[PDB]
């Protein structure tokens, strides 16, 4: 699988899946990505992220 935020490959047997109000599903690879998302930041704007580079 791939992280719906940064874009790196989520190591199997790791990570969290956040289920939104409408039913949408967001797989995260780490807490760092979850926290950046909660801050309202979009992955495209952060240079360390694979979705950006």
């Amino acid at each position: 699988r791939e992280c719906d935020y940064c874009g790196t490959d989520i190591e199997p047997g790791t990570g969290t899946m956040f289920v939104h109000k409408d039913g949408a599903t967001t797989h995260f690879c780490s807490s760092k990505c979850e926290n950046n998302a909660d801050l309202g930041r979009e992955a495209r704007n952060l240079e360390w992220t694979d979705t950006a580079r």
Binding site: E11, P12, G13, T14, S30
Partner: protein
């Protein structure tokens, strides 16, 4: 009428003091069933990783599916069974009779023992056989040591010596099986005793925490509410009633916590291999890199990284052996991050 509540902590792991030997000592051994064999082995704790595995359990609704299982990596290099000790049945229990040693010894065994220069392996063997004829022979155990030199992450070279029982067939056939292992040079591997998928009992001397209070050591409550601000936070209510006018040893008190011997029952051996397949990127934290004979134990194992853990075939298994589990994936991801 004041609610009931189970006591704080168990009274069966006492006295909660520092262990005499850092090398664990089994107090029980498996029953004599099929073919003769050494009833144990030993390794050195490396660290932890996870494994994706295929469900072996026939009674599970998930039989055949991918399941993530936590695993403790333990480096298990070949050990040397340097002698055969024999016990005799005396009216005062089992007392050691004689020992049958070797000629071939490891270069750095002299760091622990006063290595034998002059011994008679035949007179010793004769004394043991005269005892078997008399019907006085108890059990047959092997004096065994580890080769920490084979493990680059463990600083020590000084071998950890421990006694291990040989059980199985008849007392005549296991005497012969024991003498064969010894007379060669004593070299045996994890494979000789264990097969992946079997249940083992891991014994180890826990992580030392020095002195800790009742809350950590016995799991007692902290002072609650208003009582927490008065000058008492982590101290118990009282040391006992007015009568008996003494403090009972059963009351939760401060002292040594950790560095105790524990024998963790029914641990599944996920895989026994050789190489660098379970090693973590950047190396196991506070340990190092694994590239040699290893064992993957399901879940946790007592003691810190670098500590000597002991293995023994489960004396009380609950489940039937489901041999050689299919390992789909082993994580090599850095333990830092």
């Amino acid at each position: 009428p004041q609610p009931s509540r189970p006591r704080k902590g168990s009274l069966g792991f006492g006295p909660r003091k520092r262990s005499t030997s850092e090398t664990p000592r089994f107090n029980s051994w498996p029953s004599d069933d099929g073919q003769p064999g050494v009833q144990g082995f030993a390794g050195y704790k490396a660290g932890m990783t996870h494994v994706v595995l295929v469900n072996d359990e026939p009674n599970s609704p998930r039989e055949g599916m991918e399941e993530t299982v936590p695993v403790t990596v333990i480096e298990t290099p070949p050990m040397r069974a340097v002698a055969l000790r024999a016990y005799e049945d005396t009216p005062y229990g089992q007392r050691p009779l004689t020992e049958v040693w070797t000629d071939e010894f490891h270069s750095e065994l002299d760091r622990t023992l006063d290595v034998p220069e002059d011994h008679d392996p035949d007179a010793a063997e004769e004394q043991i056989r005269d005892a078997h004829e008399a019907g006085d022979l108890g059990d047959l155990r092997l004096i065994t040591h580890t080769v920490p030199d084979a493990v680059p992450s463990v600083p020590k070279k000084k071998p950890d010596v421990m006694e291990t029982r040989v059980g199985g067939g008849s007392v005549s056939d296991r005497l012969d099986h024991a003498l064969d292992i010894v007379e060669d040079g004593g070299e045996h591997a994890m494979n000789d005793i264990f097969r992946a998928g079997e249940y083992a009992d891991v014994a180890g001397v826990t992580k030392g925490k020095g002195t800790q209070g009742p809350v950590k050591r016995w799991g007692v409550q902290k002072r609650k509410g208003k009582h927490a601000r008065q000058g008492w936070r982590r101290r118990i209510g009282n040391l006992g009633p007015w009568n008996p006018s003494r403090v009972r040893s059963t009351v939760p008190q401060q002292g040594q916590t950790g560095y105790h011997q524990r024998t963790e029952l029914n641990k599944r051996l996920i895989d026994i291999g050789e190489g660098d397949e379970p090693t973590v990127d950047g190396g196991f934290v506070n340990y190092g890199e694994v590239d040699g004979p290893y064992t993957l134990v399901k879940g946790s194992v007592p003691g810190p990284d670098k500590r000597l853990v002991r293995f023994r075939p489960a004396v009380r298994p609950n489940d039937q052996p489901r041999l050689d589990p299919e390992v789909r994936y082993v994580s090599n991801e850095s333990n830092q991050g």
